[PDB]
Structure 1
């Protein structure tokens, strides 16, 4: 499968999540995603084909994971935006007030700005600390998906937020959305990964 940020993957033929970013670890290909999406050794599939298994994760506390993929997958330095692409150029962290977009299998590519850093989410499973908050909208299934600036700086992966009864927060004004992402920096160093860029 071609690995692009934002696309759908299923875990152990049940849950769906979105791919974060194509990365490598030595000769191993992989992608970073959300920790809540699967447990170590869960099987990830893209379009019905097996592409890899979860190598590691942290959830709750943090919300991160990386899947190592088989040799046959194609890693790409891109994030889906409809039928087009955002090229990944690095991982400089943007500050509060910067514009940012996120891509994921449920609401597609949505943009907005960062409103706060170091936010704690109280999930049913336990607190997730250190999250960055944006007001781009998102829905169930977007988790693990890419957060990136128009300029190509990867910011993190979708963790969660406040969804209404329709499964997303896109029908509530930007001023009321809380959309939370796990910063990418610490996931790259924690796992020794390198981002693929173009």
Structure 2
């Protein structure tokens, strides 16, 4: 199967999240995502087929993980735009507050907005997660773990949480009322010694 930022994956055949970014660790294939999407060892399926499992995770405190992908599968250094195309990923340079940013995930597809704050703490039900970056692109339950990136292709981070409304998303309110929080990708790559697949 092809691994691509933003696409749906299932965890333990029970819940859903979205791929963050294809990565490698030496010859080992994988992708980064949110830690709250799966406990260690959780079985991951994409496109109706087992592709690997949660290799490591931190959540709460942080909210990060990577899923090691079996060698039979192909990694794509890109993110889906949910209309038949991809956006090439070219690096992980972090963007400043006010910069434009988009995200991609299985519930709301491809959505754009701006970076609006950094080093935010989310008081999730499972506990605090610190150091999150906030944007005002909208998102919904199921987009978690999915890619955040600038249009020029710099990976920002993986979808963590935010102020979803009773319909399960914050797309029904204007961007100015939105709080959509992602875990910065830089520390995930560093902690686990992973390399972005680029194109």
- The question of 1:123 aligning with 2:124 is answered yes
CA distance in 2 between counterparts of 1:100 and 1:182 reads 14
Q: Which secondary structure does the structure 2 equivalent of 1:150 belong to?
A: coil
Match of 2:194 in 1: 193
CA distance in 2 between counterparts of 1:78 and 1:196 reads 8
CA distance in 1 between counterparts of 2:44 and 2:38 reads 9
1:48 CA displacement: 1.7
- The question of 1:160 aligning with 2:152 is answered no
Q: Which runs of 4+ in 1 moved over 2 A?
A: none
Count of aligned pairs between the two proteins: 198
Match of 1:6 in 2: 6
- Describe how 1:135-154 pairs up with structure 2 within 5 A: 135-154=136-155
CA distance in 2 between counterparts of 1:193 and 1:73 reads 17
* Residues 22-45 of structure 1: per-residue CA shift (max 9 Å, x gap): 000011000000000001111000
- Describe how 1:27-176 pairs up with structure 2 within 5 A: 27-82=27-82, 83-176=84-177
Q: Which secondary structure does the structure 1 equivalent of 2:176 belong to?
A: helix
CA distance in 1 between counterparts of 2:39 and 2:73 reads 21
Relative to the length of structure 1, the TM-score reads 0.99
1:149 CA displacement: 0.4
Root-mean-square deviation (CA), in Å? 0.4
Relative to the length of structure 2, the TM-score reads 0.99
1:13 CA displacement: 0.4
CA distance in 1 between counterparts of 2:40 and 2:69 reads 13
CA distance in 1 between counterparts of 2:16 and 2:117 reads 27
1:59 CA displacement: 0.2
Q: Which secondary structure does the structure 1 equivalent of 2:156 belong to?
A: strand
* Residues 94-129 of structure 1: per-residue CA shift (max 9 Å, x gap): 000000000000000000000000000000010000
Q: Which secondary structure does the structure 2 equivalent of 1:189 belong to?
A: helix
1:47 CA displacement: 1.8
Q: Which secondary structure does the structure 1 equivalent of 2:90 belong to?
A: coil
CA distance in 2 between counterparts of 1:162 and 1:145 reads 16
* Residues 42-77 of structure 1: per-residue CA shift (max 9 Å, x gap): 100012200000000000000000000110010011
CA distance in 2 between counterparts of 1:47 and 1:13 reads 12
